[PDB]
Design a protein around this ligand. Structure first.
Ligand SMILES: Nc1ncnc2c1ncn2[C@@H]1O[C@H](COP(=O)(O)OP(=O)(O)O)[C@@H](O)[C@H]1O
Ligand SMILES: [Mg+2]
Lengths: 274, 251, 96, 97
């Protein structure tokens, strides 16, 4: 089962003769491929919806609301920012000069991804965007400790930065202006943080992709493949999410059930044929 | 000196509503400022303020119309939420105070049980007028549904069985009107006929027990409530007639 | 003006909580207040054993670094906030 | 903009934690290092005891010194690098070779 015509059809069959469900899955599978992830959520309006997010997008919010830039709706857009992650919580480490001044010497807007930010470090951060020395914003990292740190180094190679660890032979006060990665632009909201394009070699990315391929199977079969493919889609290609619409709450349970059924079937139909 | 509006986040959000209105700056312990370091620019200004035992009022405070409209535009994103009800009550409350004004209706009654009846009839009327305003109105007496049913008569489906589903709906759109008449203890059969014979807004007035123009007689259904009633019932009833089995716990 | 006695000097605090001097460093949240000062006026000297009058090594109008204990007391003179301290509380005298 | 320490007190610039030269070459990190070494800038006049006036501090300038970091040591910012100030009593040994 290959062509998107055939895919939409096997999708439609599992959907109990709903053509919309099949063609929509086909659209997602056509855009993000075999490996793109597709999710089903309860709906707002009465209509089915297919959203496509391309490039790197992960789930976390900005810790301080005052960082908002150009864009309304609390949108923060930063041009060519720099990202570094230390694994640790930053309150007392507020000194961190030599590194900031280096960034101060650069005169660029920063995008900051850390394990977490204490209110103490936050206050002086507010002062920087108001004062104008450097415009800077900071948002929290996506996951749990082991899972996040594994997907953090993945982000480092994307923007060409190097991960600094306090759990490693590297220090919070020690960083260089060159250690940071770059991106074309970044947009941050209450829920999601986004990087459009980072600057990195085609070599490091798929080199990193070839190494994770051995990690795809292992002993673990299905359960880490889920977050791993979750990670994989985010890093190179893109992820797709389908918001399933319904009129009433009881119909939502029926609509969603038919949608997940058809989804698994296309995957099965895709890999093993029909 | 007066206390802040509410418990946290109710209070803190309404300072920024209040702060931008009077053009002052909110002093927070959560940012790089503190109370002992403050400027006269951190202060807001107003023409007059009145405070009584229970109330505080600010008469025409001075802040840009640009900054004020900025806070309302930010609440537009706040208008659409997952909180549904009570979220809408307290959210517009902040907005109304900042731009418009507030209205409160006090329902009177002799006894507490009549109070529950009067206030309930008032809440229905409030939602209805609000809904009527935004989404428009159609002829009451359920005559809208009985009229749209007349317009859809030539409609057909994919198969013969599907046709019945279509016809079942139109017959069922008669129900509301036919029910109102029955509550008057009058022949529903006769009234349905005499209304279906005619067109447009011609309908039955149940209170005056005489026919006439629904719109001219001031009998109005907010279109939203009529649209909603039809949609929701069809969704669940459509699913409901599909039942071939039922599972439950034992007595 | 007033004159402190013995070994005690009366100093006017320099700006508080703003670290804005040194490096490229900007202003932070956590506060360290007034580690330096311009003084005002000084005492005659401290007696030691019998030391009688030994002139204090710090002259007047000099800007100095200090460690603030309770030995220094916060007073308000001439609508100005001032610190009274013992000369032993002065660490170093900075000069441009 | 040099800075002058008062009597008995010495001002010295710290020497950064050495990547371990002991067990050469095995390096320690990343953590603070107890100071068996240190540099200096200026020196106070001396300490007075019972008219004993000022005994010149036995430490000269440019001398490499070992010290214990106690409550007595303060951290200050001078142009560029920040340096620390202390009493001669807190200085233990001067390294010479
Ligand atoms: N005087 C009247 N004459 C005819 N129909 C009326 C009159 N007053 C109300 N109606 C109709 O009866 C319905 C009243 O609904 P009501 O019982 O108040 O709440 P709900 O809309 O939930 O049924 C409306 O659809 C309206 O068209
Ligand atoms: Mg099936």
């Amino acid at each position: 089962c290959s062509d998107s015509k055939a895919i939409a059809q096997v999708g439609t069959i599992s959907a109990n003769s709903d053509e919309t469900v099949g063609k929509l899955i086909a659209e997602a599978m056509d855009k993000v491929g075999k490996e793109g992830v597709i999710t089903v959520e309860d709906g707002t309006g009465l209509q089915d919806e297919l959203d496509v997010v391309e490039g790197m997008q992960f789930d976390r919010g900005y810790l301080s609301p005052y960082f908002i830039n150009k864009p309304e709706t609390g949108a923060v857009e930063l041009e060519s920012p720099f990202i570094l992650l230390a694994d640790k919580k930053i309150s007392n480490i507020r000194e961190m000069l030599p590194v900031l001044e280096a960034v101060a010497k650069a005169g660029k807007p920063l995008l900051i991804i850390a394990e977490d930010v204490e209110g103490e470090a936050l206050a002086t951060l507010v002062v920087n965007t108001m004062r104008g020395i450097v415009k800077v914003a900071a948002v929290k990292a996506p996951g749990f400790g082991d899972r996040r740190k594994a997907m953090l180094q993945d982000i480092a190679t994307l923007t060409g930065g190097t991960v600094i660890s306090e759990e490693i032979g590297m220090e919070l006060e020690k960083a260089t202006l060159e250690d940071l990665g770059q991106a074309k632009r970044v947009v941050i909201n209450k829920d999601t943080t986004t990087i459009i394009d980072g600057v990195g070699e085609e070599a490091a990315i798929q080199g990193r992709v070839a190494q994770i391929r051995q990690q795809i199977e292992e002993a673990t079969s299905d359960y880490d493949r889920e977050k791993l493919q979750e990670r994989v889609a985010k890093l190179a290609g893109g992820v797709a999410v389908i918001k399933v619409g319904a009129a009433t709450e009881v119909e939502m349970k029926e609509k969603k059930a038919r949608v997940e059924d058809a989804l698994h079937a296309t995957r099965a139909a895709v890999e093993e044929g029909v | 000196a007066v206390k802040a509006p509410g418990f946290g986040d109710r209070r803190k959000a309404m300072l920024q509503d209040i702060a931008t209105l009077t053009g002052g700056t909110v002093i927070s312990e959560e940012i790089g400022m503190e109370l002992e370091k403050a400027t006269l620019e951190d202060l807001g200004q107003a023409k007059r303020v009145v405070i009584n035992k229970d109330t505080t009022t600010i008469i025409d405070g001075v802040g840009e119309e640009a900054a004020i409209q900025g806070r309302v535009a930010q609440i537009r994103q706040q208008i659409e939420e997952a909180t549904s009800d009570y979220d809408r009550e307290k959210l517009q409350e902040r907005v109304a105070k900042l731009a418009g004004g507030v209205a409160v209706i006090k329902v009177g009654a002799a006894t507490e049980v009549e109070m529950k009846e009067k206030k309930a009839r008032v809440e229905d009327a409030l939602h209805a007028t609000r809904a009527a305003v935004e989404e428009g109105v159609v002829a009451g007496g359920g005559v809208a549904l009985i009229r749209v049913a007349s317009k859809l008569a030539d409609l057909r489906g994919q198969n013969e069985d599907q046709n019945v589903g279509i016809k079942v709906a139109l017959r069922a759109m008669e129900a509301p009107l036919r029910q109102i008449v029955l509550n008057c203890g009058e022949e529903p059969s006769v009234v349905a006929n005499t209304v279906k014979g005619g067109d447009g807004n011609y309908g039955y007035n149940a209170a005056t027990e005489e026919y006439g123009n629904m719109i001219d007689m001031g009998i109005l259904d907010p279109t939203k409530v009529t649209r909603s009633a039809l949609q929701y019932a069809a969704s669940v009833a459509g699913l409901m007639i599909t039942t071939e089995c039922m599972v439950t716990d034992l007595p | 003006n007033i004159r402190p006695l013995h070994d005690r000097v009366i100093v006017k605090r320099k700006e508080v909580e703003t670290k804005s001097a040194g490096g490229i460093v900007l202003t932070g949240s956590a506060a360290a207040k007034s580690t330096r000062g311009e003084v005002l006026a000084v005492g005659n000297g401290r007696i030691l054993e019998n030391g009688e009058v030994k002139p204090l090594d710090v002259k007047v109008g000099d800007i100095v670094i200090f460690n603030d204990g309770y030995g220094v007391k916060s007073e308000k003179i001439d609508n100005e906030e001032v610190l009274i301290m013992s000369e032993s509380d002065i660490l170093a005298i900075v000069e441009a």
